[PDB]
Amino acid sequence: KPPSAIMETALYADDLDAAEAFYRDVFGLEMVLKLPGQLVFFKCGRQMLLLFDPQESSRADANNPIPRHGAVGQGHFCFYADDKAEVDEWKTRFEALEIPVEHYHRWPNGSYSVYIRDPAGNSVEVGEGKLWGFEAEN
């Protein structure tokens, strides 16, 4: 029996406030945990989007047994969309916010994706489940 799902996705942002506002507003994500200058954790359906300041998640506290991590550079992750329409709605919401649409892509099977950057430069995508054969929610 392999794992049934991915519960947490980690991204790193040196400016946590700019990242906290980006996801809170652009995507309306619920914020669950927040420790100033350290991290901001959002919930998305049954998954968690974890944003860490790479410098702190990297720091070794003697009483914190939690394994350390931290990456440098531009990350990537994709939000799920139910169809081209949801993808289109998101693309429009980005235009309405002055957020550049780095890319809009139609895949061989005819599915779509939209691409943007969060304040840290991470590649944030929105794609319909069709990209990987995930039947619509139902």
Added chain:
Amino acid sequence: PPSAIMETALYADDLDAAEAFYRDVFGLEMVLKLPGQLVFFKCGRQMLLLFDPQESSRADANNPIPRHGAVGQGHFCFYADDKAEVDEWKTRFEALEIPVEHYHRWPNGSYSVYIRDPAGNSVEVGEGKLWGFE
């Protein structure tokens, strides 16, 4: 808001060692593979994307897809029904002689296990009780 997260990306220099790991240790189904470039696995309704950071960053060719690539140790977590499932994987890591970096009991009585994939990424397996997911 988006109803879910579909893709999670990790980086690794040695893709074959990374593929072996996620395929044999976790039994994830491979969906896409481009030699020396990337390997994508399916996990439930999600996708774990493995990239060679150098190959994702490199200036195009005419790859319209945005560039990315991070160097360092990343992190992500697999979902587990309860403690029994967290424990099964813990036992499985030991059977595979993979060192268990950390076994943790959270304040609400939730459990997680931590190990490292070949690239150094912090790979976790925690129960949904952790964030209140029924």
